[PDB]
Write a protein that binds this ligand. Structure first.
Ligand SMILES: COc1ccc2[nH]cc(CCN)c2c1
Ligand SMILES: COc1ccc2[nH]cc(CCN)c2c1
Ligand SMILES: [Ca+2]
Length: 223
């Protein structure tokens, strides 16, 4: 997260870190057994780390649970990033509490102008590299579909939306991939892609979670 703020330990209780020897992506806990992330975060050997603040220090609220199964969306295209969503099932159920909590799925899509919270352990610099230990947060509005498409000609599908600041300076970045965009208490987005980070006229692009709720629910119901 570039241009954000330190969230505060365990204040984003649905935020997970996906770990394969190191943090490599975010995700969102949606029930005691399941995490939603980006399809571009797929790899084998994932350990889901819940209750994290400092990802390099055991602080006492973590739960570390290995994935039993990953399900990339059937229509994910890794060249265009269309349908950039994946589900991860935990080998055992997380113990839910005030610091490890699921985030509600949307019942309808969110509108341009809605304020959201984007979070992760990604790079905090737009030119250069610095990776934080503690979770970073950014409040950002959803942008209009028209401004999103104008910013990224030929690339925005009906399964994507932009959020952030056309002036630059505030954005998600590398390592925030797969993490949450939460608006009015609902998971509306997943950190998906963008041109650089925090660049003028190049806002972050996010998977439009509301399009996937039926797939998520039916997948959970049979897996
Ligand atoms: C865009 O950066 C990342 C970062 C972490 C990642 N893990 C696995 C993948 C590729 C998915 N098959 C990936 C990509
Ligand atoms: C500019 O390099 C990267 C590298 C990896 C990334 N993952 C997601 C994003 C977009 C964040 N808005 C991103 C950007
Ligand atoms: Ca920790």
């Amino acid at each position: 997260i570039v241009g954000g703020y330190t969230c505060g330990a365990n204040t984003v209780p649905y935020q997970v870190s996906l770990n394969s020897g190191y943090h490599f992506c975010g995700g969102s806990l949606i029930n005691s057994q399941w995490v939603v992330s980006a399809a571009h975060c797929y790899k084998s050997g994932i350990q889901v780390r819940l209750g994290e603040d400092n990802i390099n220090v055991v602080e006492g609220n973590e739960q570390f649970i290995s994935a039993s199964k990953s399900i990339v969306h059937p229509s994910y295209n890794s060249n265009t990033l269309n349908n950039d969503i994946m589900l991860i099932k935990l080998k055992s159920a997380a113990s839910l509490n005030s610091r490890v909590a699921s985030i509600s799925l949307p019942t309808s899509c969110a509108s341009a102008g809605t304020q959201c919270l984007i979070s992760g352990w990604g790079n905090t610099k737009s030119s250069g590299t610095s990776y934080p230990d503690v979770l970073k947060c950014l409040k950002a509005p959803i942008l209009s579909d028209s401004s999103c498409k104008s910013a990224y000609p030929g690339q925005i599908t009906s399964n994507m939306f932009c959020a952030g600041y056309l002036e630059g300076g505030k954005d998600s970045c590398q390592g925030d991939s797969g993490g949450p965009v939460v608006c009015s208490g609902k998971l509306q987005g997943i950190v998906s892609w963008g041109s650089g980070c925090a660049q003028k006229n190049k806002p972050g692009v996010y998977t439009k979670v509301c399009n996937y709720v039926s797939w998520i629910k039916q997948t959970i119901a049979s897996n």
